[PDB]
Design a protein around this nucleic acid. Structure first.
Lengths: 133, 108, 203, 260
RNA sequence: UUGACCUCGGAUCAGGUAGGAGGACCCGCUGAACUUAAGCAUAUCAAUAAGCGGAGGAAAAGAAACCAACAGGGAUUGCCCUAGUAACGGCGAGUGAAGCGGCAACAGCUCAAAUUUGAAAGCUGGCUUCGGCCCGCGUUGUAAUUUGGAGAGGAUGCUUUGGGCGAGGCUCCUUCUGAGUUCCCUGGAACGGGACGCCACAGAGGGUGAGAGCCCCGUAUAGUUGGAAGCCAAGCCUGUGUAAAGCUCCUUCGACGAGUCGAGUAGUUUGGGAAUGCUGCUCAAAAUGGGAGGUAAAUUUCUUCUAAAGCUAAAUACCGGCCAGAGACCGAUAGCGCACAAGUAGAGUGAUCGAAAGAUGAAAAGCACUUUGAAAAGAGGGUUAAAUAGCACGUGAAAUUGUUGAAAGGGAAGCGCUUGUGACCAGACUUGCGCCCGGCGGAUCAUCCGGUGUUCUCACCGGUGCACUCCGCCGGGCUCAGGCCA
RNA sequence: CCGGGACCGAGGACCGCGCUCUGCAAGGAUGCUGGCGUAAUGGUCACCAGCGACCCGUCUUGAAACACGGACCAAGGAGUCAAGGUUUUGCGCGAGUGUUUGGGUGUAAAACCCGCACGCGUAAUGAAAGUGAACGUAGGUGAGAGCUUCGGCGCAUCAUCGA
RNA sequence: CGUGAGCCCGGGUCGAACGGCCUCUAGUGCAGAUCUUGGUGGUAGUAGCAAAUACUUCAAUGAGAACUUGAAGGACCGAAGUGGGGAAAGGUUCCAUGUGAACAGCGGUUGGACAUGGGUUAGUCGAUCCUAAGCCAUAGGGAAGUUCCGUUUCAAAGGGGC
RNA sequence: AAACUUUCAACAACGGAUCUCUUGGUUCUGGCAUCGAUGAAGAACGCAGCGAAAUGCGAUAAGUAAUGUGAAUUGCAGAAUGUGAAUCAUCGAAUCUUUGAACGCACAUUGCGCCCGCCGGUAUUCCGGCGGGCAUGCCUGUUCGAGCGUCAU
């Protein structure tokens, strides 16, 4: 149960915030868990997904398909994965939108900023574990 | 509640002088009779007095502390001397206190 | 007797904010206590007797202490509001008993008062020394210096040998005589001065 | 809102040969013009007898009757048949009323939810907690839209003494669903008789069961009530020797023969 | 002639200020009628609506020309009570306070009336090298001192003070936080069902292809990074008395607000139509004087205050603005007029009036290609879990309509009771129980022994039974009970 | 006394009244037999037949008639809330009673706790000043439920005479 | 199944929530109100589509031609016009291409419709300037005030030169 | 017999009830005090590669700077991306057309001016444009004055 007076348990307000969130908020909303190898490597459970990541789909009809993220379409809250497409009437290929919580990140598109994010999350997790221990 | 009302059943079938600037605090004087006089004594001490374990003492009752200004004379008193301090007293109340062996003292 | 002939619905006041207002008052009281600590949250008030004949049996807290009370207790009128004492210049002491009770109250407060120096390094002779600034303190003067005995004791025991004789002629007759004399003050004075004038005329 | 149905200018068209005498919206050029207004039978009109906030929402109850009801609920909580009749799973409970040692709850002994859950399973409230866990359902109606989405059964109520047991057990028991906690000095009838039905399952601490008498002695103006019946066993009264020895002989049986 | 004062002017002079918006609440002014009184000029509605002026985060009020009559209370405001009371009121409908008392919150002060007269000690502005210097205001009075609680003058001997650091704490944004996407079934998709776990100071809420504590955001508590600006504050350094300040006593002195108070009259207002306030007009004060003491007047007393100058937080209000949290509220004819490019579209010269209108699907996968048509479209064939979801789109009622099937009908139909015909149907029944034989398959037959529980004499469990005893099955035979109509 | 016909079978061990007494026609039906075992009985719907049968609501007066509303369908649509009385019902306490203006406390509009005042009640009467309720087992007489030691005691209440 | 208001089940359609029992609560039950809003009939393929004299032939375009176009005829307005231009008012209706539906009470290939583009050139024409009837500031005076009167005044109301 | 009219049934129409949903109302509660001549509220006109509206913005125009985050936006087309994307968040620096209390005079006009500078066109003279200014009441000071109002000489 929530205790803080600044926290609202209103379904209407929560749904309005979710479906009218700005793009920077939708980035954090569009987060995906890491694989077990990456979790044990980085001490991080989940990160916001971005283009260039390698994902495995673990829910839905396209389960166990693996590929690189080609687009993070934040306006419909979906991502596009390589070879995870369908055929239209005409036979052309159109991508199928997958929610990021239905996938697991198997390889990270890594640079200085992602390394900084992982470092802050890992340091915070160890600090909390040491304080509560 | 609405469900218990008869309407739900009926659904389908329809001198002297004038006193300017009166102040009641002038005329405040509550009265108590003598048959309730012993109730103002605390209970245990009252039982001792009525049984007769206090033959050399007399209780002194201030009516103004209990909120009464006049001692009226309805009822009868036991033969116990009681000092009563009151602002007002009726003649019969004073007479019955004197027969009981006490005194009515006047205060302001 | 229903007074609903005006537009009463325009000015109906409900009180659904009663618990919220109590919470607000409690928060303000906490903030005031924290700002004034270690001083008590309220000032010292005197003991006064309620006016009119209905309420003169009972004592209560007044506004502030009189200048005569402060002078008799030895507290200057300029120091008094700065050490938690309320001062009232309108009230007078018409009788000795209330004056004595309030002077005793002020002396008890001054005996229980701890006074910290204005500068820590330079305490003065009127200030509490550092080995006496440490004691258990109170924060509510309305509780610690309240009205202890508001009414007179309603029950007292005396020996039977000390029972008073009483007013001669009876208490009822004494009351009737007092009323009759009060109603006949002026008539007897007119008769007396007329008799004196007649005696002066025909001496 | 007090202005609803009345933010419009509408005048009746009078007695005539065509239309009913409802007030109609003036003007033209839109669908609203000429349509009825202000009536409770009209679309977009004022309701009959609009609801006001100065309705009497709160009920003043005598403090003596509140304390009497709390005492009756506490007495019904010590009756094991009523616990079963109120739906509680108490078949594995060792004794009613269930009193646990205050050493098992005092301080930070059950400040963790795992420790509190382990204590409940050890003392036997586990089936009742599991009943609450399995009883979760989605509410029928507009309560889902209005913030009341789920319903579940009520579990045990742990009564503790804040002076000796502390208050970290409240945090320890907070996350277990259906499990409630209460100080011994602030007992709530809304918890002791949920829904107006008697027989709440209560887990007591030894400190709370020690301060219960002091709590009911400290209540100024209230004493524990005297019952109008001294012995409640009607069978024992009726089949006592004192009553049966003075009775007239039976004038019939439970079944009567049909004479004609 | 020259200059100074006083009064009145000019300047695109130097520097400032006001207007308008908003107006829920606040301070004033002005001011109805419907209504209720049988009607109605008193009255009521109502000292309200509309109209006008002026503020703020609150405003206003406020430190007694008070209340009282007591053993006296002691600025203002608000709540409870006083109290539907005292009182007012045609022909009565009605109206209606206050002191005390409990509480919330409390906080006190500034001028005018005095000569600094051994020294205008005061202040705006300009220029500055920031040290000051000028031009002025002002003696028709700017500082210090005094405000009735007093104070001024003395006497008296003791007490009081200015600056600078400051540990630490608080307020606000920022970095970070626990646990399954394990296995099986249904399903287009598990967030469903089942099994095994884990977290919990977090089982609030939301999302994700169906009901998710452990997939994601968040949620709980301690903290933990980084920054800004304030506030509080334990203590610690220093100057000390040039000056200011308090207390005590006292011969004496002790200024205190005028077209104002008050009176008459008129209007309005009030519970104060004998005791209310305000305004206009007329008259017009005093120095123990004046006001008040709810019945007019004279005389003698008494008790309370000290008007005609001014400031001041809190508790109180808040249909406006900004931010936030909730509900036994409404669920698209409801809820605000407006859930939508709604004060929009539209109408009116104008003031103003003022709607209708939400929902494919998880995902557009929104129908490739062939064929018939001028096309719209149709037909195949496709997508989808479903097109019985085709941008006329969830579900898809009734009125009303088409086709198909059945029936009736010589100037109404419809309805009740009872048959009949046709069409279409719900039950019931299918065998059960008990004996007598025969054949199988087993010993949870009776008694006894030990343990355990109980209702304290009843049971269960382990041994014992050795098959004329028990329990099921399979064939017969017999009795009984079995459905509908007679 | 003896025939002929119609309709009906309520109840569910025994008990009772009786008689014509191995039993019975005596406090309510059994026995025997046949066909069928399914649309056969039964039911619903449509229609024909015989008989029956004004169109509803409203208004009016005594009543009809007149008059008024009604093309059809869906959804909406009208004795409610507050204050104040009064009678009755249930409940707590009871010569007292009322925590919730307020304060304390809290898991925080909840629940729990606290008390000064105050309201109503405990005394009335009078315009007011004022005064203020026991002659008596709180009286006598006649009833009166109930109890009784069977002499009486006598609730509530009523009538009457007293204080 | 229930006397009844109603309750329950089967079959079909459908796609995400809902119900029994005991208490609590109310914006709680419709045939009428010339009721409100929305929708739909009979009437009924009916009344009607009859003022302004009037149309015809061939060819082309086109799925389709009385009301499109070209030619050929026949007529009307008859200079107070059915002509050529403007003021008010409208605002792109103007021009060229193209066009499904809707609209043009019949049709329509046509259109003031719909879609995309284009088009308005001034020292000399007007506005702009002047004053008319009239209106608004200033001085000043009213009014509680929003504001009213006042337009030459009871104003130190300004030009020029040496 | 059919047709027609009516009744009943299945399917199909018409229409949008019912059910389920809800980025919306409604009511309560808590916190806060912040508009404008340093030009507000309001109005008009513009601004996107491809917009009519809603939204945002002002000729620096669906925006600039700065701080933070850290890889998009998306209907199409085209490009940019560690000073670094973004229809992102924050926001202390700016820009801010014509108006409006609206202020040079006017305004049913994109009308007519005055003062001081600058720019361009051959330009000391002419013509356009730009920059800074020119409203009213009132206060304080400055400076220039008027009056046999009045003082001294």
């Amino acid at each position: 149960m929530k205790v803080r007076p600044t926290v609202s348990s209103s379904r209407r307000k929560a749904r309005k915030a979710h479906f009218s969130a700005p793009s920077s908020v939708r980035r954090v909303i569009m987060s995906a868990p890491l694989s077990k190898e990456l979790r044990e490597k980085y001490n991080v459970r989940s990160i916001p997904i971005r283009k260039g990541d390698e994902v495995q789909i673990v829910r839905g009809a396209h389960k166990d398909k693996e590929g690189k993220v080609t687009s993070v379409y934040r306006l419909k809250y979906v991502i596009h994965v390589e070879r995870v497409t369908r055929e239209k009437a005409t036979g052309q290929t159109v991508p199928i939108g997958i929610h990021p919580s239905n996938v697991v990140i198997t390889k990270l598109h890594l640079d200085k900023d992602r390394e900084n994010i992982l470092a802050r999350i890992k340091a915070g997790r160890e600090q909390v574990a040491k304080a509560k221990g | 509640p609405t469900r218990f009302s008869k309407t739900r059943k009926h659904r389908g079938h329809v001198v002297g002088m004038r006193h300017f600037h009166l102040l009641r605090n002038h005329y405040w004087r509550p009265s108590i009779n003598i048959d309730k006089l012993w109730s103002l004594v605390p209970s245990d001490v009252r039982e001792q007095y009525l049984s007769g374990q206090k033959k050399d003492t007399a209780p002194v009752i201030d009516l103004l502390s209990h909120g009464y200004a006049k001692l009226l004379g309805k009822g009868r008193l036991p033969e116990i001397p009681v000092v009563v301090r009151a602002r007002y007293v009726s003649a019969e109340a004073e007479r019955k206190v004197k027969e009981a062996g006490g005194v009515v003292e006047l205060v302001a | 007797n229903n007074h609903f002939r005006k537009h009463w619905q325009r000015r109906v006041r409900c009180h659904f904010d009663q618990p919220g207002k109590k919470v607000t008052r409690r928060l303000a009281r906490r903030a005031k206590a924290a700002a004034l600590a270690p001083r008590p949250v309220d000032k010292l008030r005197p003991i006064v007797r309620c006016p009119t004949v209905k309420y003169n049996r009972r004592t209560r807290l007044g506004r502030g202490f009189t200048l005569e009370e402060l002078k008799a207790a030895g507290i200057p009128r300029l120091l008094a509001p700065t050490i938690g004492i309320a001062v009232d210049h309108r009230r007078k002491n018409l009788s000795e008993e209330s004056l004595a009770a309030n002077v005793q109250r002020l002396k008890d407060y001054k005996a229980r008062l701890i006074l910290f120096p204005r500068k820590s390094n330079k305490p003065k002779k009127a200030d509490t020394p550092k080995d006496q600034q440490t004691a258990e303190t109170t924060t509510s003067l309305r509780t610690s210096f309240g009205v202890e005995q508001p009414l007179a004791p309603g029950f007292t025991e005396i020996s039977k040998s000390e029972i008073p004789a009483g007013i001669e002629g009876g208490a009822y007759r004494a009351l009737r005589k007092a009323r009759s004399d009060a109603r006949l003050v002026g008539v007897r004075e007119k008769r007396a001065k007329e008799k004196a004038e007649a005696e002066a005329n025909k001496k | 809102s007090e202005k609803a149905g009345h933010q419009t200018s509408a005048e009746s068209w009078g007695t005539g040969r065509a239309v009913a005498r409802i007030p109609r919206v003036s003007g033209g050029g839109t669908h609203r013009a000429g349509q009825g207004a202000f009536g409770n039978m009209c679309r977009s009109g004022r309701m009959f007898a609009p609801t006001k906030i100065w309705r009497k929402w709160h009920v003043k109850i005598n403090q003596g009757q509140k304390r009497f009801a709390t005492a009756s609920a506490l007495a019904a909580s010590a009756v094991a048949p009523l616990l079963m009749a109120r739906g509680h799973q108490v078949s594995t409970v060792p004794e009613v009323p269930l009193v646990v040692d205050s050493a098992a709850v005092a301080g930070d002994a059950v400040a963790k939810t795992a420790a509190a859950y382990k204590l409940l399973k050890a003392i036997g409230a586990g089936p009742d907690v599991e009943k609450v866990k399995k009883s979760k359902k989605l509410r029928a109606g507009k309560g889902k839209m209005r913030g009341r989405r789920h319903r579940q059964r009520r579990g045990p109520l742990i009564v503790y003494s804040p002076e000796h047991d502390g208050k970290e057990l409240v945090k320890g028991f907070r996350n277990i669903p259906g499990v409630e906690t209460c100080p011994v000095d602030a007992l709530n009838l809304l918890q002791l008789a949920p829904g107006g039905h008697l027989g709440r399952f209560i887990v007591w601490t030894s400190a709370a069961i020690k301060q219960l008498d002091a709590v009911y002695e400290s209540k100024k103006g209230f004493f524990l009530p005297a019952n109008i019946v001294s012995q409640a066993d009607l069978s024992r009264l009726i089949n006592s020797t004192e009553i049966q020895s003075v009775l007239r002989a039976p004038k019939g049986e439970a079944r009567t023969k049909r004479a004609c």
